[PDB]
Amino acid sequence: AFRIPLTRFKSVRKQLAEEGIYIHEGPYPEPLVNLLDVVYYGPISIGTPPQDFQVIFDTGSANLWLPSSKCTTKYCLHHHRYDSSKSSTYEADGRNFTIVYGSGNVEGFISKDVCRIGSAKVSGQPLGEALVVGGESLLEAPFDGILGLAYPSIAVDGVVPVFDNMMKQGLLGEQNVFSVYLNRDPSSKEGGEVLFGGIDHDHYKGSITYVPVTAKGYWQFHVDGVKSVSASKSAPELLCKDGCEAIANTGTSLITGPPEEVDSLNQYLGGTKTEGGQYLLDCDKLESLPNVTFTISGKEFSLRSKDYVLKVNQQGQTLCVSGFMGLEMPQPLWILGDVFLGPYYTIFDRDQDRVGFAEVA
């Protein structure tokens, strides 16, 4: 058991929306990392002596990458960079890599070195030395790179994900799991935490409801249904009626699903489609907005409007936005961002290949 503290920051997509600037997505070939949407980072260090970094701990991807000292692009010059020549434990690989991101590609070459995750010491860990990171308005971003916590099958050639090497090296004891506490509250000192090799009882109430992983790549599982139900409507909103597939993604905020289904959901909520793509709700009519519920392994996971409405500062206008939007992919998926993962503590279990949810504390 070792514990990494997470810090929450306002996403670049949000900073853009405040100045009244929107960028359309997509459609996507499948779920992609998008650096405009990432909201939680935590510290790691690489090499000997340690070189310090802030990275996104991302269940939506499986790669570890950081800006290379050899990268002199704008993004890299504005962040911490890994210098292999300064580390006595560096071990060369040298092969090239490319990753398709929603925010523009990430490219470079593979290297190996000690990766430090709090008190844990991951040895011979492959990483991407990034020479290219796309694109606009990431010069402020408080994170340097990404550390992926998904399965090895969606890693680039030459990388084994960080958690997998923690497993091979016996660093987690008997529980090959990691647990994630996300605090969406702006005020609090702790933004959240990732607990490696354990489950923290202090962070949830009730019991944990497990769901089996369906396709090993993303942390992907089956959802029984999605619905919203209200005393103020002649009909319910019933979606995902015959079951659907979802992924848990700590690398994003909004809940994303098949467009026609979430458009319908947003209409039911009284939403108004912005030219930006998000749906506006009346800020004075948030009180009687119905819960939206996800049924997983026969159990209901309810979201209150307090959980799913996002507030944004436009100019002077405070302005309220639905935390659900459509994103088409060929193999339709609900992507569960922090809107879902904030009010639910989440256990990621590689022993049994399952994901656990319990009410947060």
Ligand SMILES: [N+]
């Ligand atoms: N990107």
